[PDB]
Design a protein around this ligand. Structure first.
Ligand SMILES: *P(=O)(O)OC[C@H]1O[C@@H](n2cnc3c(N)ncnc32)[C@H](O)[C@@H]1O
Ligand SMILES: *P(=O)(O)OC[C@H]1O[C@@H](n2cnc3c(N)ncnc32)[C@H](O)[C@@H]1O
Ligand SMILES: [Mg+2]
Ligand SMILES: [Mg+2]
Lengths: 376, 376
């Protein structure tokens, strides 16, 4: 939203794919539960899956070059910058070129620290990340309103139960419910606004950056490495010594073994019940087969979904079946977009002409115009 | 229900005092919050308080003798037992003398291993503990019903908001949904009640968790001079060391006169309170002392209180006024009972005649008949 600057096309070597949850959990009062995501991957014979914490913010592709002379020779960028931080739609995340420049050099340092450039034999890197504008304004504004809906919501159930008992032996009650309605709808728009980055941050201290893929370095697309390699390699090479770049909370799960799977459901219920948005389940290996397999499945906590979905969180058999249809329509977009993204990277890495790279990149962008369920 | 054996009076050298929360919180939608308990102790010049996890179970006084002849020479007990585990009303916790005997010797062991008898120069010990009959019977039965009220409760709100947006464009099925939620909740109420009174006996000694928080007395000394960190630590070291049955308690020292510490405190409370814990018991760093000060204040989580209080968790100004009165009438019972307890111990320790000890002990028991608000 404040992401309003178009980016130099020379930087757009990749666009992130969309993602979908699993078919509506058949648990009562639940729309998404870890068991479906797990089932999905067992049935298609995967066995080991990685569960990563679904950071609540915006997706951000981050490219970092050693210097501005690298963005010239390697990317063809001429405006004298040495990196970029763009959203899922090819726009600069930040309406502020300096804040961005600061974030970039900030990562550049931690890489310099970890001698990353040498060990990967590369003078540049592309990272797939979640960026969270966790400014104080935001935190407070979100928490207090959640609190408000929580209070007003209970005050409803309490006064309503009373009203029942007393009539088993109508004025303020709707006012307490109308109140709850507003508090909730407001809470909806807040998360909406926050996730699209409509509330700009003042300083780089209000930012948390959580990389979860190391997409590419000089002469290689690391789509062969597994998602633990990613988690670990990332955590080591660019999480140390900076509060701004954070390692991600994860857990390896054996979807065959009901022992790892129960520890998994627990782990999910924990961070889901301590504020987390949810988790993204990924097949231990980056690209998975037999048909292509979703590169990730989003499993989101009840509390989060109750906000996003609104009163239509609870649904009947037919509105449910529709969600399952939508889940399908999205799973296909996800696959197509995912392949385009991958090919795009591949092409760029082997030094093909940029129009070839963009053939794929703008392909992802094209597909993103296709209609889907925003709630998915 | 299942603790109904009267105990040999020779074992009753102490009865535990009642406790009260702090005055009704002025935070919206909150009945009890860490800030009041903290304030209480600052307004009265304490400064350092200890916050202990309020284990959700039953209070149990546990006396452990080295052998059966120690119970003879020291306590006058003649039925050849070497320990006892009795409730706050002088009854045997267990309706099963062997289970109890098991529990006792279990503690006896972890003590020998630690060298407790030697270092305290004593061949017996009296412990103030929380006992939790966490059998599968109870965990499942509690969790699933809590889950049920959670589901059925959210479903009412959803279907009610929906119905509100409808009335603007112009059945009693909504009432039925509400009725369901009412039942689920009331049942959940009776479950916690039943569980906390120990109406659901346990299969194994493996279904038991024992959490000591005071070391009341050893040979020739009532340790009411040691501070509550001494207690926590000394207990954690001497009798929770290798056995799993007996557990050290989660605590945190708080400086009520510092923003940073009080805030870390409120956090610590919100964490475990929202991780299933019942709440915390706040204790003045030093056991005694000046004076007229509560030896402990209970601060209970919102989720817990909602169950216990029911629909009357939300109240008006008059009702709240009454709770504050009741909080007062209890604070006095607590003080009087607490002193009787302490004196009772003191007398027993300095070898006074038993009728002198029981003069105090039965005094605590007498006071417990005074009518109070059960929800406090
Ligand atoms: P969400 O409901 O926003 O849909 C998927 C998006 O989640 C974000 N995300 C957070 N954490 C991760 C990890 N660990 N891996 C992949 N994606 C993550 C991304 O921005 C997705 O677009
Ligand atoms: P609760 O609302 O049951 O009222 C006081 C009782 O709490 C129990 N309790 C749990 N944990 C503790 C600690 N750490 N210290 C003292 N009391 C505790 C006791 O059974 C009380 O009777
Ligand atoms: Mg870090
Ligand atoms: Mg232990």
């Amino acid at each position: 939203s404040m992401s309003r600057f178009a980016a130099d096309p020379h930087w757009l070597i990749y666009l992130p794919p969309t993602m979908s949850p699993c078919e509506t959990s058949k648990k009562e009062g639940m729309l998404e539960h870890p068991i479906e995501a797990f089932e999905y991957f067992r049935t298609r014979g995967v066995g080991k899956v990685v569960c990563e914490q679904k950071h609540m913010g915006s997706r951000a592709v981050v490219i970092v070059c050693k210097d501005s002379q690298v963005a010239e020779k390697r990317f063809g960028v001429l405006d004298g910058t040495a990196g970029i931080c763009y959203t899922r739609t090819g726009r600069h995340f930040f309406d502020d070129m300096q804040l961005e420049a600061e974030l970039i050099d900030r990562v550049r340092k931690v890489l310099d620290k970890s001698g990353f450039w040498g060990d990967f034999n590369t003078d540049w890197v592309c990272l797939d990340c979640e960026l969270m504008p966790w400014s104080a304004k935001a935190q407070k504004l979100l928490e207090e309103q959640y609190s408000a809906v929580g209070i007003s919501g209970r005050v409803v159930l309490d006064e309503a139960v009373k009203l029942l008992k007393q009539a088993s032996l109508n004025a303020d009650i709707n006012e307490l419910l109308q109140r709850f309605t507003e508090r909730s709808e407001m809470m909806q728009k807040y998360v909406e606004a926050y996730r699209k980055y409509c509330w700009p941050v003042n300083s780089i201290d209000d930012l948390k950056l959580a990389p979860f893929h190391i997409l590419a370095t000089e002469g290689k697309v690391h789509s062969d490495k597994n998602h633990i390699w990613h988690m670990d390699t990332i955590a080591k090479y660019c999480t140390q010594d900076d509060s701004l770049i954070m390692a991600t909370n994860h857990i390896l799960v054996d979807v065959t073994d009901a022992e790892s799977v129960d520890k998994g459901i627990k782990w999910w219920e924990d961070l889901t019940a301590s504020g987390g948005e949810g988790m993204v389940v990924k097949p231990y290996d980056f690209i998975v087969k037999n048909e292509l397999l979703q590169p990730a499945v989003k499993c989101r906590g009840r509390e989060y979904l109750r906000i996003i979905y609104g009163p239509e969180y609870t649904m009947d058999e037919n509105i449910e079946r529709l969600r399952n249809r939508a889940v399908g329509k999205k799973r296909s977009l996800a696959l197509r977009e995912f392949s385009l993204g991958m090919e795009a990277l591949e092409r760029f890495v082997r030094n093909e002409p940029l129009y070839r790279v963009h053939e794929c990149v703008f392909g992802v962008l094209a597909l993103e115009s296709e209609p889907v369920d925003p709630r998915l």
